[PDB]
Each structure stands twice: as structure tokens, then as C-alpha cells.
Amino acid sequence: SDRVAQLTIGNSTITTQEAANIIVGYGEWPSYCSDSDATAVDKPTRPDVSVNRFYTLDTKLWEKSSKGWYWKFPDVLTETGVFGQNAQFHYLYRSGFCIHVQCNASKFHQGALLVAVLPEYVIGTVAGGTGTEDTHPPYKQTQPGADGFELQHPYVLDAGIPISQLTVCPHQWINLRTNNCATIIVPYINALPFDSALNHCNFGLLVVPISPLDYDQGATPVIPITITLAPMCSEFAGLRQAVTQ
Amino acid sequence: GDRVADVIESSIGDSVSRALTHALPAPTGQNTQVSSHRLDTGKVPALQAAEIGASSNASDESMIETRCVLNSHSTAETTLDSFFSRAGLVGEIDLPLKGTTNPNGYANWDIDITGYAQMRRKVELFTYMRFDAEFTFVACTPTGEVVPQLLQYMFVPPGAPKPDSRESLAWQTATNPSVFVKLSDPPAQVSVPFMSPASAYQWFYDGYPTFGEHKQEKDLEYGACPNNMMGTFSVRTVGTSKSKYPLVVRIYMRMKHVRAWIPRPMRNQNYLFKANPNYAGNSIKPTGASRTAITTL
Amino acid sequence: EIGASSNASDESMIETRCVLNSHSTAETTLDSFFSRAGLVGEIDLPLKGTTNPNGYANWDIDITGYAQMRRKVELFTYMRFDAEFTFVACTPTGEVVPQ
Amino acid sequence: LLQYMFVPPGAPKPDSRESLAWQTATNPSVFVKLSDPPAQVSVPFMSPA
Amino acid sequence: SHENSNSATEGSTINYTTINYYKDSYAATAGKQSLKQDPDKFANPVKDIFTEMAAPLK
Amino acid sequence: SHENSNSATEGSTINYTTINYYKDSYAATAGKQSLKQDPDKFANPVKDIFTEMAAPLK
Amino acid sequence: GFPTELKPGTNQFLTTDDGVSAPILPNFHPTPCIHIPGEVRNLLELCQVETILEVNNVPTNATSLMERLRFPVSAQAGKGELCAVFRADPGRNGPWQSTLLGQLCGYYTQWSGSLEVTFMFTGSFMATGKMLIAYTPPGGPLPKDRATAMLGTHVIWDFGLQSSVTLVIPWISNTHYRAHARDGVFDYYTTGLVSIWYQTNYVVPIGAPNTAYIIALAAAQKNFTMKLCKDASDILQTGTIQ
Amino acid sequence: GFPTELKPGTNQFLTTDDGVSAPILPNFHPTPCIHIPGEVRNLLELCQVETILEVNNVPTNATSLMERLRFPVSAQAGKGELCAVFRADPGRNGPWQSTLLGQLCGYYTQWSGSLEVTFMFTGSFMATGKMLIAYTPPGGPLPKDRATAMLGTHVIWDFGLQSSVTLVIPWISNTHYRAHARDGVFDYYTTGLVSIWYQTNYVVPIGAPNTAYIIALAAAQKNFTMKLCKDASDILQTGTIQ
Amino acid sequence: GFPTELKPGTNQFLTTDDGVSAPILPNFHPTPCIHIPGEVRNLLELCQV
Amino acid sequence: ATAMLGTHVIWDFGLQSSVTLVIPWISNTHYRAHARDGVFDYYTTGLV
Ligand SMILES: C[C@H](CCOc1ccc(I)cc1)CCN1CCN(c2ccncc2)C1=O
Ligand SMILES: C[C@H](CCOc1ccc(I)cc1)CCN1CCN(c2ccncc2)C1=O
Ligand code: NA
Ligand code: NA
Ligand code: NA
Ligand code: NA
Ligand code: NA
Ligand code: NA
Hints:
The structure is cut from a larger assembly and holds 1 copy of chain A, 3 copies of chain B, 2 copies of chain E and 4 copies of chain G.
Chain A: E1 5-9, E2 12-16, E3 23-24, E4 55-62, E5 69-73, H1 81-89, E6 90-102, E7 110-119, H2 139-142, E8 149-150, E9 171-175, E10 181-186, E11 203-214, E12 223-239
Parallel strand pairs in A: 3-10
Antiparallel strand pairs in A: 1-2, 4-12, 5-8, 5-11, 6-10, 6-12, 7-9, 7-11
Chain B: H1 5-8, E1 24-25, E2 47-48, H2 60-63, H3 80-84, E3 88-95, E4 106-110, H4 117-123, E5 126-140, E6 150-156, E7 178-182, E8 188-192, E9 201-202, E10 232-237, E11 247-263
Antiparallel strand pairs in B: 3-11, 4-10, 5-8, 5-9, 5-11, 6-7, 6-10
Chain G: E1 2-4, E2 13-14, H1 43-47, E3 51-52, E4 71-74, E5 82-87, H2 100-105, E6 108-112, E7 115-121, E8 130-136, H3 146-149, E9 153-158, E10 164-169, E11 178-179, E12 193-198, E13 211-220, E14 225-229
Antiparallel strand pairs in G: 3-13, 4-13, 5-12, 6-11, 6-14, 7-10, 7-13, 8-9, 8-12
Bound molecules: the ligand C[C@H](CCOc1ccc(I)cc1)CCN1CCN(c2ccncc2)C1=O (2 copies) and sodium ion (NA) (6 copies).
Family (chain J): Belongs to the picornaviruses polyprotein family.
Function (chain J): Capsid protein VP0: Component of immature procapsids, which is cleaved into capsid proteins VP4 and VP2 after maturation. Allows the capsid to remain inactive before the maturation step.
Protein name (chain J): Genome polyprotein
């Protein structure tokens, strides 16, 4: 009754029989930009169903030694379906997201993944080890696209901050003995009403195993983790030719 | 006009962001109510499901027999203004006589407060912050001595000409705000408004400032957001000749009328650079003290 | 040719949305623009010199010797106003002496 | 010019004239010259008792 | 007073009681903020709220 | 106050809200000006005004 | 006396401080103010007045300076050829520096609003033609061809009795205000690009010039405002003005 | 002029003085504030959010840091063996330093209120067990055995569909507020000890891991408040930050 | 500014002067005062013992 | 990734042994005739 659930949006429907409720980040639902917060004057385009639907972009394999991964939004979708096109043809973009991380196992497996959403997830580098070299993360590390990227030092979230406090952000846990998915709804988060879907990543999705995956020899060893997400209340403006970056 | 049903009944355009929580008044800590033994089935406050993502709702009253306690402890000292409205060092500007830095009697300081750990760690607890501020300028020689020297501080907003010398024409300051004061006077002090083009400054910007390819040589710009760059603060000794004394200017900032959004984990590795969260990889230390065994203090 | 600026607006050239503009026009009023103290004169009183080595000096009240201020006021042909004058004195190194 | 700073129990005590603790971001500090009149401030009742 | 409304908090859900002498409100003191709080925004942002007495996973 | 009227703006279409301590008004602050504007004076000083919709040369 | 206590700021001189100062001439009454035409109350009033935009800002020798005030059009080869281009950034070095809007803009750190450029064709009466004037919002690189330019905000101008056409550069920004844009991280505040193409062709009969010019006039819309007063980038003085 | 008289304090600069200072930009209006999710009004709001408590704070090499976030349980010999222990002092060096509560706590000299620690079992679904989690108020030395621990405030946790259990560390002090406790005379403000014992045993069938981990999440109750603002004990900077 | 004029006494520190001084800890609330036996209000109370 | 761009359902095994995929009527014509290889593939419904 809180364990079962169906998420239908657009022409896509998701089901789960082992859920742990739903989290609505910062207590508020995605909403379209009001006429008072807005500043751009052109009439926006709100594709609706063609872009606000569930997209299943990537699958990683959870292992006894995995460190964790992260994806940046809306970077992950900028090259997929009608959403991608609108994000490319338009200068301005804004939307919310419904994130559904999937991972099932057996009643004999164990482990716990922390699934969180961290706004303005700026990545740092190890500074050449000694901290004397002022290195910087490459485009492929800041905006990893759909394949996401693996954390080098999860304890500090590759940014000099404790993962132990990441729970201060909208999150859920995927404890195998309890559930097989996490569901987080996120509203538009920025200090501006609209922004570039290309140059700015509003937040990052983190999937990190805090309690190591384990099982005995003989149990299915391939435990996938799939990422499905749906934009919500997508709005675009400032039309012109398509641009990938 | 709209005729097809799906259009009439759509929610496309709702600008009213539905909120699930509302703020209540809490001037004091919650009181404790009396409670007694409960030997029930079905009822189970102690049992939780952290997976959901919420903190425990279990209270003192439901876990043990409690007495009544009228809590009058105030929550006033933990408000944003109470926490941040305390002047702290955010800049130091040297004006030496014989030196390698500013031996010309003037100096330009980029307005960035991330060069000092104490202040920096506090503000980085939040992603976005909107506030006004009170700046105080303490000047003296390097020994802390006070000398009869007249100085001019000038705010050079982005786009205004940065003085290139002690005799620059820009010191005419016809439009820029300037402050003339002696080292003998008390510290200069002024109020600054919230000047960003954005609704709030942000200590973290996960993106690039421009479009195009982001090749190696341009990665210095990852995380740079012009909305946080308020301009330059220039200082000079007021004269066409070099000053007879070496000077030091300490800049203190005290925020006021503060608003913050999106809390984040707090820095646990030493800071290295102003512009980024880079940390020393060979020296990743735990967040705190450690011990020999989990079963011993 | 008529001599007037275009009357064409955003609404009539493209499909626009509604935007409630609350941006203020206060900082562009005349007082906001001009009521900022700027340098308009420098008077030297040197000891051993070619100019005023007599301990006194006469300055003709004319503020057109300084570009910044001058260019601002010359945007208008006629101007009527009151003014606040501030006199900053010191030695050439910027030192303060009991004089 | 002098700097007086109140270091409550648990705050880092400066170990030198150049200590980082003098950044005084949260502790209350008073900057004053020996030439100024005596510094003066009001202190509340701070005990846990 | 009859001053400008340039304070960074102009129009906040929490009203302030401040002091000022200039025509620009942002020059005012920090004053006293209002003591409201909303822990649930961060500590319990769940859609279908669950009781204390009941078991969280129904 | 009961002072002289020596301000350079005495009798202006835009009223001011100022502060003063002396008997001569011109010593007062700059205060706040009134926010009126008349762009047409410079941007459209035509005798027979022409509509936007219509063609300017009828 | 009454107990007071001096606070920091004491004795300082802030050039923008709006305070009270003692009057030098007590009981002095100024000369009455008669009526004078053209009183201006707000700089914004001046920003709505069109001035000549030097789109053709290439000639530099004294004798050819007047050529910056106008660019040409002429019979082409019907391949939707490019006529001219320029950035729409009003407070940026370039064509806009010739306008009063651009200069006044230099006295403010941030601006916000829609801009407008009116193009007046000064060819002969017998000359006809259609042009495509486009505005490419941020992120869009200089359109390689007309087809690409046509994908953004644009106007198709037809020569006729009405010598002019107005291109509106609607306010399309992410931030409520833009600061003066320039090469570097501040290109974040760039407004975009304006390109002019031949939609049809400059056609003329026997007896009329094969080349005519266009004069561009620019100004701001009524939603334009500026803020955070600052000194202009230029100081028109080398040595001392005597 | 009006008769005044300067009092002590004149000219001093108190960093916490809340006074008025002259505005540098007259008539300047800030950019309007749009709606932004997650506004926080009081640090106490953050103290009620659970963060990971590093009960297992022993590993120090970089490659094993993530192991501090969780401690283990496993099949025993049914002798009510001890699983783990830690001080409940929130503002004391130790496990609490990993929590946001502990860090925010460092910015205040005194605190008051009940704390709570929620333990989440991450073993397999087929694993069962009962644990005894006890809180020993001041004066009680580290319980030598379960029987001794059981004499104080405690909870008996049963593994099941509900993965977690919450131990409440009720406010039991002599003083209304406690200052940060540490070795020495300041141990006067110590909160106490938390010990975890096996009530029954970690039982598992054939085919499931003999070792599973527990993740501890801590935060404060709604009667928690802090006072007497102070600088944190750490300053994350060695030399100058460039 | 407002016309003032300093009088003798300016800058002096009188140990018995009962004036106002800036608070070091804004918005700080002291620990509540519980009931304690034997409160004395005036030294004269002690003189009668 | 390509399949996911159309109408779909994500099925989770559990107490409920079954899941229902709906093949909504998405045609250009009001009716479809029996589709087969050739010009009559015009009436094809699609792929699952
Ligand atoms: C309060 C300062 C602006 C101070 O502006 C003035 C202006 C004039 C004067 I006189 C004194 C100070 C802005 C501080 N901020 C805004 C955000 N920011 C920043 C720095 C580094 N990385 C991200 C943001 C940052 O350093
Ligand atoms: C505000 C000054 C008058 C200042 O008068 C005093 C009088 C007494 C004192 I003590 C200080 C200043 C007049 C400035 N103006 C009026 C117009 N003007 C001028 C200069 C050059 N060419 C045309 C006009 C010019 O320089
Ligand atoms: Na005066
Ligand atoms: Na004065
Ligand atoms: Na007198
Ligand atoms: Na001041
Ligand atoms: Na006296
Ligand atoms: Na005082």
C-alpha cells in the first residue's frame, strides 16, 4: 500500500512491488515559471507529452568493489528524443525531474545504495596529489553524458565534502532486503527562472554503495542498476538553430 | 478558443508550485509531555524505515516514561542573521614600499571572499545566498602602527576602468563610489546592497560561463559564474609621490538581511584555491578523530 | 524621415508571453546620476616652486579641467542645481600635517 | 592598534600573533587603538547554570 | 520612515524589526528575524506521510 | 520645518522628500525624486501623431 | 553634555554619501527659474531616442569617417548572400558605441530590456528588394547561411513607400539583468548576433544606381532599465586640460 | 552645536556590533528575488536531518575510508557479546564529527536537547536477530557486560520488514545546557555512553552471508537548541588559499 | 551631519558611570533562572542578623 | 535505448505475477485491414 506503485507520465508507465514511498525534494512539486519570476519575453514552447516521459538511459553493474557513480542533469538527456532536440534548438530551458533508480536482487543478497540529488554538484580534482598543481576536471568529467562517471574518492564526493552528510539532500536508500528502487521528484533549482541546458547542470544524481554488495557463491552475481528519469513541466525559449554545446 | 477536451483539462501552465510543508513558529524548544508505560501491539514508534529517506519520527515520550518539562530555551541565536552577521576577515591588501607586489602605492583586489577558510566554510553550507553587507576597512603599518597617511578606496564595478597607477585618471571617481579616510581615523565602514544580476549569489556553479568547445586550456573556467563577480576594490595612497610608510589593509565583511537556499555537506578537506573545491589527493583525511577499536573508547 | 523613433513593440513583432517587469528606473534620474562627488579642481601650494611659492593660491571656479566630470555635465546644454563641495588637503605624499 | 577577541570554550585559542583564529568569523572581536578611549562592551549572563 | 526598498530581504515570509537613518533600506541594521521553522522540508519530504505509531512500510 | 526656499528645485513638477538641519533649503539632502518621464518629447515630437498599425506615410 | 559614542565610519568621506552640509550664503535666494523647453527627467528618456548605429565600422582615416554611418546593398547573384553582421551587445565595443544608448549604457554596470534597430533604405525610388534581418540568441554561432539565420527571430523587409523597417531584439536572457559583455567569462551576458541577408535581390531598372546605402538607427524599448551606476570606460583627456 | 560628550567605546570596531552604515549606492534596487526551493530559516532545521554517524571510526588509509560509514554484526556464540560502543557527546571528537549535527554544533558553545540515533540493518532478508542498544547516563562506566548495560535507558531491536530502529538519547543533564565536553574538568558536561549488544544472535540460513553491516544515522530531537555562537575548532587552510 | 559640540568629560572613563555599552552577543538568551532559596535584595537585610 | 523511446511498461516481478502491456490504437485510418507484406503493410500495427 506504500510498497506497490505505478508511475505513468507521457506514453510510459513504471511499476514496482517493493518500493519505499516517494520523495519530493525540498517539499515542492515541479511547476511552470510564473509571469512574475519570468524575464524573457518570447512565448515559451511547452511540448508536454513528447518530452515529459520516462527515458531509460543507462545501466551499471553493482559489484563487491564498486565505488559509486554520478550523472548530471539535464546533461544526461541533451541528446535523447524530443527533449534533446528542444534543449538543443533553444537557448533557455527549465524543468523538473522524476528519477527512478532500479536495482533488484534476491532475498539472499544484501547491500545498500544511497541515492541522492545534489544541486550545483561542482567537481574538484586531486590537485596533483600534493595539492600544489591547480588542475581542473575535463569536460568529459564535469558533463559525463549518459554513461555517467565513476567516483574516484567517494568519501569526499570528489569535491572535498563528506558523503556522510549527503543525506541533507533529497534522497532514498536501496537496501536490498527492503526495496528494489528509489524514487525522487525534483523541482527546478536555480537562482534564475530559465537557463541553458547545455552550459549549466542544475544538479547531480549520486548512486553510491555505502554497505557493500554481498552474496554466496552460486547466487546470480550480475546485479544491474538502471537509471530511468522523466522531465516534468518542461519549458523552452529563445529559439534558433540546434547547438550541441 | 480551446475546444478539444485534453486541452481544456490540461495542467500545462500551472505556476502555483504545490508545497507539501509549511513553516510554523518555534521561538523555543519543544516541551516534553508526561508519558507512561504502553504495552501495545500494532503500535511501534521505535521501528523505522530509513530507506524512505526521512528522519525518524520517534520522540522521547514514546520511547521512555517522561515527566513534563516546560522548555523555554530560545532558538533565536540559530537564525541565519544570528549566524552570519558577524564581521570576519575576507581580504588583505599589501601596499609595501620596497617590494615585489605593490611597490607603486596602489593595489587592485578582486572582490572574492573565498581566500579565507573560516568565513568560506560557513557560507559554503548553502548553495544560494542573497544578502546585503557591511564592510569595514582596518588599515595600519605591518607592526600595527598608526601613521598620518591619507588613503582612497574605490569600488570599480565590472566595465569601469581599473586604475593602472597611483596617478590614474580613474581616481577622479566622478561616478564610482570612493571613500577617503586617514589611517588615524577609525576604520572606514559602509553598507553594500545585493548586487548580482541573479536573484542570489551562489558558491557553487556546476557549469561553464560560455558556449563552445571546452578544451583543456579553457577548463580554468569550469565553475566560473559572472553573477558572483561584483568587480574590483582599489586602494591608493593619495599623492603623486610615493608614501613614506608601508601599509596593510584588512577587509572585514558582516552580512545582514540574509536568505539562503539548498544546504550542502560541510567542507572536510583543507581548502587550496579560491576558484574551486580542489583538495589534496595524497592527504585525504577522515572528517574527524579516529580510535583503535570500535569496542573501546 | 519623419524624425520620430520607431513605435514598433515586442508584442507586435513576435509572439510574446506575459512578463511582469518590476525593474526600477530610480537609478537613472538626474540626481542619481550626478549626485556623486568627483574631482573638479587641484590647487598646489609648494614651498620651493614656480607656481605658488607664496603660501596662497587663487583658483577660478571652473570645473571643466577634468574629463570624467566634464563629459557627464556636457550631455546637457542647460543645468540648474545646488552643490556640496568637499576639500581634501594633505602633502604631496598624502601625509597629514598640523597646518 | 590592538585586537581583543573572546574565545568561548571549544573555540581555537590563538597560538601566535599570526594565528588563523584571528580571522574571527564567529567569535566577537574588538579592534581599537591605544589612542582611542578605553574599549567598552556589554556581556550577558553566560553560564549553563 | 519614507525610504527606498532596496533591502535584500524586501518581501520575505519573515518580517524584520530594524533601525535606519539613510534613504536606502539596505543600510539598516540586521534587527530581529521572525522565528518560524520548517524542518519537514528537509527531514520528512515524503509524498504519503507515515504515522509514528504505524510501521513505515505498509 | 520653517526654513527659506532657496533650493535650486523649488517649484518643480517633481516633488522631493529631503532632510535638512539649517535654515536654507539648498543645504538639504538630494533625497528621492519623483519617477515621471516623457520620452515622446524627444522620441516622437511630431505634430500629427501616426499609429503603429498604420503606415507612417499616409 | 549628552552621552554619545563614535562608531566606525567617523570622519570618512564617501563620495556618494547623501548628507547635509552647512550653507555658505544664508538667506540667499536663487534667480527664479523661467520656462525652458526640453527638460529631461530621466536618462531612460534619452535611451528611447534612435541614434545612428555604425554597423559599417571599418574605415578609420579621417576623410572616410562619414562612411561608417552607412552600409551598402546592391544587385547580387540571387544566392541569398550575406550583407552584414554585428553583435547585439549594446554595452560592448563595436557598432553600438556610436549610439547615445551605447554611451549612456557605459555609465551603468547592468542593463535589462529589449532593443530595437530601425533600418532606413536610401536608394532611389525605382529600387526594390527584400531582405532577411535575423537576431540569433546566445549560443547560436554566426549563421553560416541564410537558411541557418532564418531559424531565429527575424523580419523580412520589403522596400516600398515606407523607407524603414524595425528589427526588435527582444529581451531573451537567463538572468534578469546583463552586465556589460566582453570576451572572456563575461561573454556569459552576451545578447547575441544580428545578421542581414538578401531575401530576393536589389533590383533596379535602366537609369538608376546599382548601389544604394542603408542607415541604421538604434535605441531601447520601453522595458529597458539600467542599474549600478559606474564610470564610463573612456576618459577623454591625455594630459592636463588647460 | 548641540552639547554632546563622548563615552568609552568611542571609535572601537566590534565585529558583532549591529549598527547602521552609509550606503554606497543610493537609489539602487536589487534584482528581484524569484522563488527558489529549499529555503532554510534556522540552523535547527538542519539539525533534525539525520546524517551518517561514523561509529566505526578506526580505518584511516584513503582506500578504506568508506568503511567508517558502517559497522558489522555476524553469527556469534550466544554469550551476549558486545558489538560496539561510543560516547553520546555530540560536540566531542569522535563518531559524531561525521554528522551535520556535530559540525553545526561546533559553531555554538552550549547545547541542550535530546538526541536520536537510527540504526539501519543492511543484511540479507533471510537474516534475523535481536540487539540490545543502551544509553548509559553520566557516572556510569563503560558497561562490562550486557547485564550492566541493561540497567540504563535502552531499546531491544528486532530485525524484520522494518530495517531500522531508533534509540533516543533523552536529555538527562544536571544543567539546563551542556558545553562541549572533553577530557578534563569539562567532562562534567559529558552526555554518556551508547553500547550495542547481541540480545539473541545474528541467525542466517544456508546460502546467506554470515556478515552484514549496520548504518547509523543521527540527528537531534525537537527540544534541541544551541547558544553562545563561536568559531569552529577547525580551520581548513594551511597556507594562503590562492 | 547634525551639529554637535563636545563638552568636558568627553573620552573619560568613570568607574561608577552607569551607561550603555554595545552587546557582544546579539540575540543571545541567558539560561533561565530557576528558584533558589535565600535571595538577598539589600545589604541592610544582612545588617539585622 | 531505442525501444524505450516508444510506448512501454517496466515490469517488476513480485506477488503480482502478471503485468499488462496496452497496445493503444494509434492509426492514421479509423480502421485497419489485415496487414501483410506488400502495400498492405500500410495497415501494420507495429512491433512489441
Ligand atoms: C559581498 C561581496 C560583494 C562586495 O561588494 C563590494 C562592493 C563595494 C565595496 I566599497 C565593498 C564590497 C560578494 C561576495 N561573493 C558573492 C559570491 N562570491 C563568490 C566567490 C567565489 N565563488 C563563488 C561566488 C563572492 O565572493
Ligand atoms: C558649481 C560651480 C560654482 C561653485 O561655486 C562655489 C562657491 C563657493 C565655494 I566655498 C565653492 C564653490 C559652478 C560650475 N560651473 C557653472 C557652469 N560652468 C561653466 C564652466 C565652463 N564653461 C561653461 C560653464 C561651471 O564651471
Ligand atoms: Na558641512
Ligand atoms: Na557634512
Ligand atoms: Na558653537
Ligand atoms: Na558608516
Ligand atoms: Na560635562
Ligand atoms: Na560601548
